[PDB]
């Protein structure tokens, strides 16, 4: 086939089974869409927002404006803003559930506990909360405070942004009028702006997008990730097994898949109970095992070890259909994106049971719906185990032929700001030393999805990462793009020898890989803590640091909201494939050429790994020169 | 000339001036878009939500599913849900500002007061709030409670829905799982569901649309309209002037345009100050006048009299460009949709000044930006007056040639539930008796925009209304469609001559027109109070009543969210033009054929006035037969 598949042999092997079984799958479905691609939509110059449409910009035939009067620049930026309301809403949804989960845990009504009490008290102190009473009392106050940050209106000052952002950024944001309200109000204001005949000004709409990105990081992401650390521990580096060879057909295999890790943690706790292992053995299995997929899986591997029960990370979202084709999964428990909506016929062919554990996730052919509530997660996890044992006995065992690829890779996971400081001996200064000396030229935040638009699964991401480390650029990674680097072997100690002269030397001395796994796209806020620490140590603004961000195989608006944040934060932000805006020439000029004089950041483009890496290195070296290094 | 223009002569005269002046306008811009219409988008079977797209459904080349695996029905319903997030967001934005305006008024910080104190105390008692102390204390408490209704989550029981919705409906909603959270959480949940690889199930997406409609009416619309009644009075029927002949070129003319009435009320109060009338006269004007446009204008005409200062209502949103072509406007002050984004060049040519009074409203060529805050609205109004005096002197008077059409129509505005009860002698019983006897066959809620898609401006709306009243069907109207019927003369006593024999008899006896102006699309919740009262008097469910809803020239999602509410409320709901759904056969079946067995309601379609009226009458007669009347 000339069908774009994957850079990973395990996925290519399983794609062959899908094709031979004549089952629909993302790789094959790309080809028919390629025959009929709409150029207007590709360029951002179509609109479907009201009944006078649908409209298109085509100046050659006199269609210079939409019926309502909007121009191409406003049209393109408006649809970008509307889609980014979806991205912000997902992070806001997740944060709210994290805060309710901490509150209910503190009240004693979940299987969870308060694990990182030091972080709980430090956060409460930094936010000037009352710290008297028991740890549980403090956790309740923190949960209510972080809910207040979600709800804050555009007229009440926030505290998270003051604690966690650097000084010069705050001044820039106040000058521009982009200090945000809470994300719930900001996303509502953004959506209202996009209604027909409201905001048709591309500069205004772009500014609203920048505000929305700031609200997402300071108003949702930083709080949610620190709360998940309080519940489940702060990650430290440890070795993890990845890729699809981690499966063994003789066990009952439950896979959790999504972004929110609460059900997965409850499943691991329940699977460790003897009553449930005994059930699996009586059903004919060797034992019962739990596995993570995509971002929920990554959240767990950041904080938990591989053991007899929890087995590691399968892969990113384009691995889900291949995973079912192993014929080894008993339950796939899905909590959020990505849960692709044609899994039904694959689950039927390969003998797997599909369980949704969120009211958000629905599609044809799901077998069970167990919507999450903190006070019911113990019961949900036990029901899932019961379903999995019956599915193994009645659907899979003795009926489905397994075809599990042999590929397994090792990755060191669980890097956090805290783990970096520890690896440096307690201070950031040794990292500053090696950057000033030129051994490490700079650092890149790789915050990405995966997609088929600009290559086989993960092709641009992995090859770009190789080119960056060759140029002595350290990578901090999150998202489906992080899962790709783990599976490709860039996150273990052998990868030291893939780096250039200075970075390989530093990594060898510190005993760390040249790509540091920081988790998920939800950890963009956490990555900003590292960049903010560098800004303070060098006493410079973030826009002047030798850093950059890349989302090189972006798919949807969890990544683009992080890119909008990076722009507001003053950074060179590479995005591929092109977002649908290139038919809007004044918008393109704003994002790629004029933003350095506004926020300090800019959008960069392209899918050639060498050219993209060269352009990033040139920016880094420009920053270095002005710093005197 | 074959161009689609308007049913209204005044608009047609002003279109000729726009054309002579070679200025772009909605009527002329429709033609170029016609030449290149995308049939995939017309049918709802294109998607632009992620980078693997843009996708289209075309079975001939094997493009049966999007790359992600979503089918045509999920694709169409998902984009409908996302767009209705925008609609819900505008109502939620408006409600929040109304509640902050009431609270700040109670604290003494605005030019407004507590006008309908009886409504304040009755609403507080119905909601079981503390009524001790000062009226201002009660108003603060009510404002805080209604803000809580906006913010309540999916697991916290509402009170507005219990007070204002009937039990038989509440039982259906609980059985279906569509009892909503507050609108802020509901709209965030809906947006998150629309992200790629989250909710791809058309039945689930439709159900989430019904929930969203319920959250909008009970969590935003009823509260905001009753709070506006508390601030500005409860409407009673009175005579108003409408259409573009109300302008006079020798006065300073300030037009307020949008949905939120706060700036408009402040302008009327400021214009009544002798110092401001004196400024106008010293500038060469006869005096200073305020006019209302679209929904903000309608809110004011519902509650305020015509006098020497406030002159009435210009018309609906397709009248805005023609209105500027009169060469009589000094300031257009814009607070929300509809503010079409190419007004700039028209304002320049005709010598009018554009002022935005909301952070939502931005587009090229606006002259001043005065974002609303309750504590600043007194200063905003004064600044607008000073701007208008300068503009009259320097831009318009004696320099721009006015061309004001002669047309003025009379309309009886300000119908409310309270006004209907008063006209009936204090109870709904007389209306029940004339429905039972067959003098009035049934009643229609016409809750509508205007558009060019399915005819010249207001052609379908006005002619459908005429066909309905001829069939002895009473109309309650709101929205741009209400402005259309007012301008067409269907809302005065002369219009009784066009009603059928039974309705004309009732109208003459009660001294009311056959079309009752209930205000805006934001008054859908208020209209439900009348429908709930009819169902209670007859001891039946709302789905059993001889009523229907029509949005016969819908444009955007302020109207569609009201249609989704009407479906959830069990009603036959006619919508034209077709929403972009007709390429999705199972979604079409759900909405048009299966919903009667689910909620009781159904979507009806079509743009022929006679056929649409006959289909509505047939539904009414089916309901009557089942009731035995
Ligand atoms: S919002 Fe404007 S450009 Fe978009 S469909 Fe409506 S008339 Fe066309
Ligand atoms: S969400 Fe699915 S159908 Fe829509 S553009 Fe992405 S791959 Fe195509
Ligand atoms: S698919 Fe309709 S304009 Fe692109």
Author numbering:
A (entry chain B), B (entry chain A): 1 to 629
Task: Give excerpts from the publication.
Here, we report on the structure and reactivity of such a deviant enzyme, termed CooS‐VCh. Its structure reveals the typical CODH scaffold, but contains an iron‐sulfur‐oxo hybrid‐cluster. Although closely related to true CODHs, CooS‐VCh catalyzes neither CO oxidation, nor CO2 reduction. The active site of CooS‐VCh undergoes a redox‐dependent restructuring between a reduced [4Fe‐3S]‐cluster and an oxidized [4Fe‐2S‐S*‐2O‐2(H2O)]‐cluster.
Two molecules were identified in the asymmetric unit and the structure was rebuilt and refined using reflections extending to 1.35 Å resolution. Two μ2‐bridging ligands between Fe2–Fe4 and Fe3–Fe4 were modeled as oxygen and not sulfur, based on the lack of anomalous scattering contribution, shorter Fe−O bond lengths and less electron density at this position. The mixed cluster can be divided into two subsites: a [2Fe‐2S‐H2O] site and a [2Fe‐S‐2O‐H2O] site, together generating two almost perpendicular planes fused along one side (106° plane angle between Fe1‐S1‐Fe2‐S2 and Fe2‐S2‐Fe3‐Fe4). The Fe1 and Fe2 atoms of the [2Fe‐2S] subsite are coordinated by Cys338 and Cys480, respectively, with Asn337 in short hydrogen‐bonding distance to the water at the [2Fe‐2S] subsite (2.4 Å). Fe4 is coordinated by three oxygens and one sulfur: the bridging oxo/hydroxo ligands, O1 (1.64 Å) and O2 (1.98 Å), a hydroxo/water ligand (2.07 Å) and S3* (2.42 Å) that is part of a persulfide formed with the thiolate Sγ of Cys521. Fe3 is coordinated by two oxygen and two sulfur ligands, O2 in the μ2‐oxo‐bridge (1.86 Å), Oϵ1 from Glu295 (2.23 Å), the thiolate of Cys449 (2.36 Å) and S2 (2.32 Å). All iron atoms in the oxidized cluster are tetrahedrally coordinated. In the oxidized state, two channels with widest diameter of approx. 4 Å converge near the hybrid‐cluster.
